[PDB]
Structure formats: structure tokens, C-alpha cells
Design a protein around this ligand. Structure first.
Ligand SMILES: OC[C@H]1O[C@H](O[C@H]2[C@H](O)[C@@H](O)[C@@H](O)O[C@@H]2CO)[C@H](O)[C@@H](O)[C@@H]1O
Ligand SMILES: OC[C@H]1O[C@H](O[C@H]2[C@H](O)[C@@H](O)[C@@H](O)O[C@@H]2CO)[C@H](O)[C@@H](O)[C@@H]1O
Length: 357
């Protein structure tokens, strides 16, 4: 299984029309796998979307006495059921490193901690994360009758989107957390693949330096991520990496080659370890002073020619509604990375590559 994939983060709280637009666009484009969020942590974040998944510790779904609210499990159920009809496979991420939709800092606020990375260390927080993931993985989909544990439309669980641990640059805290959590998920669900969902950073590996000497922090362990050590964990099935040179300090004239070397390095390491590897987010800002389509072509050619298992752009959106609707009626391009199923050269490129992978 090799594929072109994408991401969409609003599949657990937008309307049926909007969810069907994303998944129909994926099918029409040849996009075989969509990576989505399976979290909405904290009462403020749930209230902002009037959709509830984990508003407080031990509360899963809508709090007793709250009426006229959406249940994010029901919306996830509808997305799964539609993806199953349309032949799209889903990778579902279980918590966010970042504060969007609550993230790890929401868990740290619940348990009265004092730094984001207490999420990995406080046993009361780890227990709450396991209680949440057990509730989700055991959840019976209301549109299918099939618990997520048994649902083949789900391709993989991911532990945490873009997890970082800057307080432990040895990389050990994340290794121990990923071992514990990936083994815990395998104990709940022996059927599905497990991946971390990290960006792929290295931690000073002999012979691996960045292109051009830029974004050295992605190679020298600054974020507390040792990708090679994480991929070596027995209960992690495939490696994940992300690629945003414009966020990371690379110059625009080096975006293409920095990305190219990033992809080559990750494929080399995963091939030696002997597990599959997925470039599961990449993006160049629409306003960058370079040809975005040609960078995306180069990167997808490299993943394809070097034997990587998938390439997934951030991000695919569909029709919009309400306050999230742009000048053409789509969900807006808020971050400069949105692709939709239109006549843009990016959209045409994805269609072309989805025929080859
Ligand atoms: O009453 C049958 C059916 O109607 C609605 O289903 C939509 C579905 O959501 C769309 O994706 C598309 O398939 O057209 C259908 C209606 O013809 C409801 O969502 C559903 O609960 C219900 O079973
Ligand atoms: O593309 C991921 C990107 O994320 C970071 O930005 C965070 C932001 O810092 C947080 O405040 C949060 O609320 O939302 C954003 C989620 O992306 C990083 O700055 C960057 O290195 C990383 O690529």
C-alpha cells in the first residue's frame, strides 16, 4: 500500500455537507488516505465549536445538562461511515502537541501542572490520556455498528500530532512516553497500525546535517525528538515526518532542496530500520516567491522514486458555510496551504500523482 494522502482537521465538528465535500473531493482526486483529528480537549474549545469530545477529565461527549450541542464522536462516526462508503482510509490523531483544540496544555491545566511537557511525565495526566484513548478506540460507531477497534476504514492510530519535549533534549522522555502509549494502544486494539504523528526531527546523527546549514535545530535534537529511536520502538509500525521549510528558518531559494534532503534522509533511515515511512504533512505557503507546484512535484517524485510509502499534503478542504466561507463559497484558506478540488496547478498535480502511487 503506497498512496497520495492529505489532512483535514474539521471532520469531527463541521456539518454533513461540509464533511461529504471533503471526502467526495478526496475520492474525485484519487487521494486514498486522509489524516484527521480525533480530539477536542477542554470545555472552552468544545464550547467554541459547540461540539464536545473531552471537555473535562472523565467526561467523554456532551456534559449532562448541556443541550443542543454536537457530540464529536457522532461527527467522527459520520466521517468514518462516509469515508467507508467512499473508499477513503483515515489516520486518526489522538491529542495535539499544540493548543488548538486544547492539546497537551489543556491536560496540564486540568491537572494543575506548570509546563506543557508535564503531559508526558504526570501519571495523572497519562492516566487521563489513556482513559480517553480507550473510550475512543472502544467507541461503537452509531452509523455502522462497528467499534473503531474493528473498523478497517481506520488505517492507523497516531499518538500525538507534532509532539515535542523541549525540556528533555536527550530524547528519552518521548521515547519512554511513546513506548508506554503505543504498547497501551496495542493492548486495546491488536488490529490497527500505530504511529507517533511527530514531525521527524533528528538528534545529531553522524553524517546527517541540514541542507545549506539552515534549520539546524530540526537536525540537532532541539525539540527532544529522536526520530530514529522512536521508529525503533517495537509497538510503532511506521515512521511519520512533516515538512514546512517556511516555518523552520529555511530561505525560500532553499525550500526545494532542503525539503529534498529531508525526504531522502528520512527514507534512508527508515529503510535501514525496515519499517514504512510516510511524509504525512508538507506545505509551502501560497505566497512564497518560488513555484509551489514545482516544489510539490519534486517532493512527491522523490518519495515515489526512493520507495517511501506515502506523501500527504497539508491540507485539503471542501465547500464552506456560515463564517467559514470565502469569496468562492469554499472553506477559507486561513494558513496559505489550503488545496481544493479546483483548476489550480497544485490540484492538477495531486490528481496526476494520485494515478501513479
Ligand atoms: O434518510 C436517508 C439518510 O439521509 C441523510 O443521508 C444523506 C447523507 O448524509 C449524504 O451523504 C448523501 O448520502 O445523501 C443522503 C440522503 O439521501 C442522513 O444523513 C441519514 O442519517 C439518513 O440515513
Ligand atoms: O505546521 C506545524 C507548525 O506548528 C507550530 O505552530 C503552532 C503554534 O505555535 C501554536 O501556537 C498553535 O496554537 O498552532 C500552531 C500549530 O501549527 C510551529 O511554529 C512549527 O515549527 C510547526 O511547523
Amino acid at each position: 500500500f503506497r498512496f497520495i494522502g492529505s489532512n483535514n482537521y474539521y471532520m469531527h465538528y463541521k456539518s454533513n455537507r461540509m464533511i461529504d465535500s471533503v471526502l467526495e473531493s478526496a475520492r474525485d482526486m484519487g487521494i486514498k488516505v486522509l489524516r484527521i483529528w480525533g480530539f477536542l480537549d477542554g470545555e472552552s474549545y468544545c464550547r467554541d465549536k459547540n461540539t464536545y469530545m473531552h471537555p473535562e477529565p472523565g467526561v467523554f461527549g456532551v456534559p449532562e445538562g448541556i443541550s443542543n450541542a454536537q457530540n464529536g464522536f457522532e461527527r467522527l462516526d459520520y466521517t468514518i461511515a462516509k469515508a467507508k462508503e467512499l473508499g477513503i482510509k483515515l489516520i486518526i490523531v489522538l491529542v495535539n502537541n499544540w493548543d488548538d483544540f486544547g492539546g497537551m496544555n489543556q491536560y496540564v491545566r486540568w491537572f494543575g501542572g506548570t509546563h506543557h511537557d508535564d503531559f508526558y511525565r504526570d501519571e495523572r495526566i497519562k492516566e487521563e490520556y489513556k482513559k480517553y484513548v480507550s473510550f475512543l478506540i472502544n467507541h461503537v460507531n452509531v452509523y455502522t455498528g462497528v467499534p473503531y477497534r474493528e473498523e478497517p476504514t481506520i488505517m492507523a492510530w497516531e499518538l500525538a500530532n507534532e509532539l515535542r519535549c523541549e525540556t528533555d533534549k536527550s530524547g528519552n522522555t518521548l521515547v519512554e512516553w511513546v513506548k508506554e502509549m503505543s504498547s497501551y494502544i496495542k493492548s486495546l486494539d491488536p488490529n490497527h497500525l500505530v504511529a507517533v504523528g511527530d514531525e521527524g526531527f533528528f538528534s545529531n546523527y553522524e553524517g546527517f546535517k541540514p541542507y545549506g546549514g539552515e534549520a539546524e535545530w530540526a537536525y540537532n535534537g532541539w525539540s527532544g525528538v529522536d526520530w530514529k529511536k522512536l521508529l525503533s520502538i517495537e509497538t510503532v509500525d511506521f515512521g511519520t515526518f512533516h515538512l514546512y521549510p517556511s516555518h523552520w528558518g529555511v530561505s525560500p531559494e532553499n525550500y526545494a532542496q532542503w525539503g529534498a534532503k529531508w525526504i531522502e534522509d528520512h527514507i534512508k533511515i527508515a529503510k535501514e530500520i525496515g519499517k514504512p515511512v510516510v511524509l504525512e504533512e508538507y506545505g509551502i505557503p501560497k505566497s512564497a516567491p518560488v513555484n509551489r507546484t514545482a516544489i510539490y512535484r519534486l517532493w512527491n517524485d522523490l518519495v515515489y522514486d526512493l520507495g517511501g510509502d506515502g506523501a500527504m499534503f497539508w491540507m485539503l478542504a471542501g465547500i464552506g458555510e456560515g463564517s467559514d466561507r470565502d469569496e468562492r463559497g469554499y472553506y477559507p484558506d486561513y494558513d496559505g496551504f489550503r488545496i481544493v478540488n479546483d483548476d489550480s496547478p497544485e490540484a492538477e498535480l495531486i490528481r496526476e500523482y494520485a494515478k501513479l502511487f
